Symmetry: D2
Subunit: 481 residues, 4 copies
């Protein structure tokens, strides 16, 4: 245009200057009607949004999922039908640290995967562990607070962390996994991902299986030592973010193979470990892995904030053929994510490009702040006599199950082999090597250093419950100093 | 898709039912993981946004502006060059009432006009009056609060309104206009619009004129009586909204002619009324109207909320060739609108379709909640060595003026004919007819009924200052009851 | 202080002027560092908060509840033990109109009552009707949207309202009540309040009764005609608000008597009308009213916004001895209110004085915006070893019940006398008088005027289902015009 | 109370369990009406607020300021009158990193000090440097973005930082200070604080001086090496936060002495360095330091979030006797802080206990979200006839100055010794030691490693402009690798 200057204000008119304010002479005050200054500063002041809680610190990439086996006998979901290729988005993260925190702290890592399927966005929001610390969502707020900062000093605190874990012994399986080698992945490319929960798969005939998801890295599982991780935390707080971005940019596209475990509907009720208990794995002897397909990440974001920070994943984002399960943790998650995203991003978070599905949305939601894609004169109510369609399926849902009882607050009933310490003990005695046990003792003793004496004594009892020998070695190492 | 049901959730998957919740059997409780119920209720709960303050209650339409005369000697603005046609949006409103308040209350009406020009959105945010009640923005918050509700009872209150007006005698010109016939327009189609403020026009050679805008209705000015307006308020609270929507729908497209008054830069400093005082008109004897063009409204909104409620107008939205003026009220407005819109709508209010310009925006603003149109890897700083342009014009701005003095808080200096009551007195004695004066006395006496005695006595003095005779008639009518 | 000026800025320093802005000389521009101007305008721009949806328009008063009978055999709740006196807050409202809408429109009225009890705030959030239009919360968003504005024009629309009601015939009982005399209360003092839902009462021995609440006005039930209500809507949009405020100010304190109906736990499952269906009343022949006590309103708010607009009521605010019931509508409400209030007011809405309980709050919630009353160094997790207490009751809850079934979306099962039109027909034929039936025909025919022909035909069928004779009279009146 | 359980919900009623959710039998789904679960999760999801931008990462303490000298000849401010003792709050921070970022990165440190004075909160919001990188606020948004993350990868980037600095050569003085020893303080206790800007002091007779503030640590200035800082960043990201909290807890109370430089009003216009240019120091030869008093920090926060994270400091928080100056940067800050705080914390941020003044606030601001301390029935407008006071001082303000010119966007005029590189050159050649110059060369060469070649070449030219020798050594070190 004839009056252009190189940039505009928000109304599209020339900005005049991005470098100097509007003043009364060169020595005078800034005037109130420097609207370019006001607009740019007001926007700057509103750039930051609340960080996620948990999983604030993370990054990710786009890719593709390709089905390479036939699992139509287990699910009718379009995404998993033979040959299907689907675009994906994967965000990796740590659990406890804030936006600016080092990537190489000892922590659980998130593995949040979206499939842009032809029947909607399917989100599989997993971790780099098959289990979690808890089995009821009422405890989750407590757990995450115990992993963050003391209320007075603003410092993370080992006493608080161990006080919570030792008073919640359901934590023992995941704490063992976390304190083992896998607590410190070398890169996100060299860790596995897991759904952790049991999900329901429903086939075209209406038959149900309980499934676990396992994403096995084709780059192998590789871990850092405590010393190596500390050093990297000081040298490069964004070590994992950079590693992923630079690997993809140079064409070194990471891959994972997806396998499921499939338990028949009726055997879910009788298996010796509760499949609806998030602190339990399903033995690969009883239920071996079945191959589904391969995930590849092959495209970096163009804008990290718009495509990764503003991405909103939810386990509630199921597609036909895939349902939730009786797992209390999973049912808590069905509520919590969308709720957080309305505050963190806004009411219309799911209209942002990264969160939009590929298929047509026809949803009964109107108005609200920042409504970019309005529904014109579509009817706002159902049934209507205006030809604007609605859903009205009645009766049992395809992805459901049964329940019976009185309203209660209590622990899940124990199956034959259920307890708090058994699987942890197997991991320590049978899965770890001798050298991994030595490292484990050092890791756990390091973590208990400076823990208040009463809590430290409870931690020794906890580790002896996991394994009498490991527990004694940890106590001896702590007392040796 | 094969599993469709008639509508979707927000992730695009089938909703299953828009009519029944997910329960444990037909008689059981609703389950927490009824995510369709949660999403639709959470969205419903976030549909309402803060109403505008002031001007909450309003509606509008799209149209066109066509230049039919040559005013290139006064401005280089593209919108006003010979022959130019521009799409427009016009929102009409009342000042004091809330979202659900009757259209036919006695009030100032807003006349908010946007031109989608080739060099950006130009907003002329006017009223149905050429003047306003005040001449310094510090008093505006006080004024609007006095026009709303008492803090204890939540009732509008005549005592509060007259207490403010009589203690702020600058109000007299606009209060006279408001209490006259034009306080009650029959329809928005039958009222005039005015910029009210003086604006600066700059031509291609850099010469400046001070201008006033006058939009003269081609449907004439027609008004209701007090009794007629009261009756309509009870029968149809949305009388004006409906009138406009139904007039356009049946092809009865309303029109206004735009005229300006143009005062040479140097005569602005010497004119006998202060052109930078928003309580003053410029006499049509001294500065006659010059025709510019014609505004037509010819298209109803498709979605009232997205296109009218979410529209964000600002006097700060100037285009090259048009600037603000020394008027303190106008300079206050340059800050206030954008600020309100960041809270009312959101940081990215100007990315909503109705607020987007027609030309390319290249603005240094990134991130924030609800960022729909991201800037990819564009540089976030200036100067940069990446070929992402910026503005850096130095020296006096084209749409500026001079100032000199010490930092002060005080009234504007009086010109030869400036005072608080003169122009009001002219309106009453010379512009109104005899019958309009009779109606005026009745209107003002009605408004003063039940005003607390000390404030009512100050109101009699105020009206006698406007005109000794009108004031005595008002006092006599009030005392007669 | 020695430098005082009459008012302060937000930091407590002298404001200097509430009336003039800071300028470069008397004729110069406003400077950016007029911080008093900025602060007052930025606050002004953030004064408005989202209106409630529904029930935007309302007002209320404080009072007292006094138990005058013995109902300890039905509940252990402290509020209802013999002799107990409790402070109360009552907010009245209409359902569909916005903040500025006339009080005297035909509508359901809200009757929202809080008791500040010694074991927490007990909220009984009722209406001026014992029933509602719907029995599943999934339909509530649809219903409220159908009662508001068309998406294109922003007008309320009779076709939309009747299209929703006739396609949802469960609506017939409440629509009959609404179109009858009680749709237009003369004052809030002259209407009854009802809980509408069945609630659970639990006594000290753990025995359960299902209860309905009935608040019978001691001023009687008095109603306006259509013509009278229209006239008042034009003359005084705040007629009910003013009536209540002025009645209390002059010592005319309104009173209601509270009665319950009490159904034994086991008879709830077998009664011939479903007590868990919000469209049904419980016959006073089967279950007569039992007197509890008297509510009096005797104190106006000191600040309407802080004490009434910012009040946050929720059916989830139960106290020991009182629980929710299997009613799907009530269980939907347990989620929805708190969710809306977090957006409308803020995360810490329940720390505002009006929403705070009288007893000590010891809640596991920390941080968030606007945290006025912080918890110092209290532990943020449970169990802790720091002596900060927590709750851990296990097993069946005292205020619970049983369920069994598969996850389904379907209508509640019908009891012996359940249907959509029976109770409506009783209200029309047996409860109304002859003159009330004549008025009813006129009201309903008036409401159907200008309803689109296909929807109007469905409305005639609907009214004939209610009562063959009333339906024919309505059709004949509509066709007569 | 008789039904207590150990904790409450938000309404004060017993929570029943903080550890288990409400389910249909022990194996069943969670019910929607688990309101304790919903409330605790909804609050958890709203705990995080937007981090500050800049200065996200910080901590602080309470203390006292004691005047020990007589400066009444320079100011009438109550806080600085002989003998006066005032409570203080001090927040320390880094500029560029996010909430979780290591304390021991090379950066400017903030020194934000509040005095709770008897005439309002006085905020002196300083840095650990007397200068800044820029002299016009229009460039500040650009600068801070260049110090944060690349838009595509989310990585901090040396090229972006040096591209901005070398294209903005006004940056040279502060960049030299930053790349010197003081870029890495050992603890916050061992750094100085400075106002950086010139402020105006006005005495009881109305005489003005331009002042600079200098807070000289009584613990001395001590710094880390690059290697030491890197190591600590990996071992303890919260090293400075912990150091301060633990020093105060053990009674090792840090102290600073406050000195001012005082330039007579008229000499401000003629001094050879522009005192209104934030990139310039005032020579201690021309204007020696004058002692005022001593700051001590002696009390840790009880709640870090409520007292430190939610603290809202602003340079606009002046008190009588202290004003802003012509410095464009300072005038930009007068707007920006309050604006950011309305979004970050909320409209009523200044009612939170930490932000409240000690004296009585009488401010014309009403309503808004989260209004804890309402104004009852106080008048909402001025003048009023209700005895609610207001300010109306007219004429020149006590803390003002003069201006004259046309509206312009351009660089400040140069004084006799003003340029971009002179003071930087003095710091390098005269203030640093030989060993500090060696470390400087290593620091700057390290920072330029991997900077894109075109930008690196501009950086060599920039450092040669600072000092021909230092610049050549830096170039040689970079090329040596
Ligand atoms: C009851 C337990 C849990 C609750 C209440 C919960 C809640 C949340 C919330 C509120 C967020 C932030 C969402 C946002 O702002 O966008 C989040 C993020 C996340 N959660 Fe959970 N969570 C739970 C358990 C788990 C489990 C068991 C896993 C893995 C199996 C998991 C994996 C994640 C991941 C990967 C993210 C980050 C997603 C992303 O990258 O955006 N969480 N969680
Ligand atoms: C210093 C004086 C004034 C201030 C501080 C002020 C401020 C405001 C604010 C904050 C809004 C709401 C903006 C939004 O949320 O989108 C508004 C709306 C409006 N103002 Fe003003 N105003 C002032 C004077 C005037 C004057 C003098 C006129 C006419 C000449 C005017 C006409 C309007 C109109 C028409 C609207 C509604 C715009 C729309 O339809 O969206 N105001 N004003």
């Amino acid at each position: 245009t004839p009056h252009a200057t190189g940039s505009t204000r928000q109304n599209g008119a020339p900005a005049v200057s991005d470098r100097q304010s509007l003043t009364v002479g060169s020595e005078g005050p800034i005037v109130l009607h420097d609207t370019h200054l006001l607009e740019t500063h007001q926007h700057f002041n509103r750039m930051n949004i609340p960080e996620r809680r948990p999983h604030a610190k993370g990054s990710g990439a786009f890719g593709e999922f390709e089905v390479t086996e036939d699992v139509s006998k287990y699910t009718k979901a379009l995404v998993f039908q033979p040959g299907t290729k689907t675009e994906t988005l994967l965000r990796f993260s740590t659990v406890a640290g804030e936006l600016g925190s080092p990537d190489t702290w000892r922590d659980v890592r998130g593995f949040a995967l979206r499939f842009y399927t032809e029947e909607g966005n399917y989100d599989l929001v997993g971790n780099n562990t098959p289990i979690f610390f808890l089995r009821d969502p009422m405890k989750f707020t407590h757990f995450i607070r115990s992993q963050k900062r003391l209320p007075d000093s603003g410092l993370r605190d080992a006493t608080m962390q161990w006080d919570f874990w030792t008073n919640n012994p359901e934590s023992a399986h995941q704490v063992t996994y976390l304190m083992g080698p896998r607590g410190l992945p070398r890169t996100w490319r060299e860790m596995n991902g897991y759904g952790s929960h049991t999900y329901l798969w429903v086939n075209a005939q209406g038959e149900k299986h309980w499934v676990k998801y396992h994403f096995i890295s084709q780059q192998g599982v590789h871990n850092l030592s405590n010393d190596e991780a500390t050093k990297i935390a000081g040298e490069n707080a964004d070590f994992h973010r950079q590693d992923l971005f630079e690997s993809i940019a140079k064409g070194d596209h990471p891959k994972w193979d997806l396998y499921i475990q499939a338990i028949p509907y009726e055997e879910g009720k009788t298996y010796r470990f509760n499949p609806f208990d998030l602190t339990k794995t399903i033995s690969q002897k009883d239920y071996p892995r079945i191959k589904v397909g391969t995930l590849t990440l092959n495209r970096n974001p163009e804008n990290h904030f718009a495509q990764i920070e503003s991405a909103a994943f939810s386990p509630s984002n199921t597609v036909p053929g895939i349902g939730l399960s009786p797992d209390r943790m999973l049912l808590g998650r069905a509520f919590a994510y969308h709720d957080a995203q309305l505050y963190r991003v806004g009411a219309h978070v799911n209209q942002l490009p990264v969160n939009r599905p590929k298929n047509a949305v026809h949803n009964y939601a109107f108005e609200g702040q920042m409504w970019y894609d309005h529904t014109g004169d579509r009817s706002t109510y159902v049934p209507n006599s205006n030809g604007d369609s609605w859903s009205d399926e009645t009766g049992p849902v395809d992805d459901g199950w049964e329940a019976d009882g009185t309203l209660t607050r209590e622990a899940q009933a124990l199956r034959a082999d259920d307890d708090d310490f058994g699987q942890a003990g197997t991991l320590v005695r049978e899965v770890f090597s001798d050298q991994e046990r030595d490292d484990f003792v050092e890791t756990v003793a390091g973590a208990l250093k400076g823990v208040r004496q009463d809590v430290q004594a409870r931690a020794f009892e906890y580790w002896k419950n996991v394994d009498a020998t490991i527990g004694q070695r940890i106590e001896d190492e702590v007392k040796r100093h």
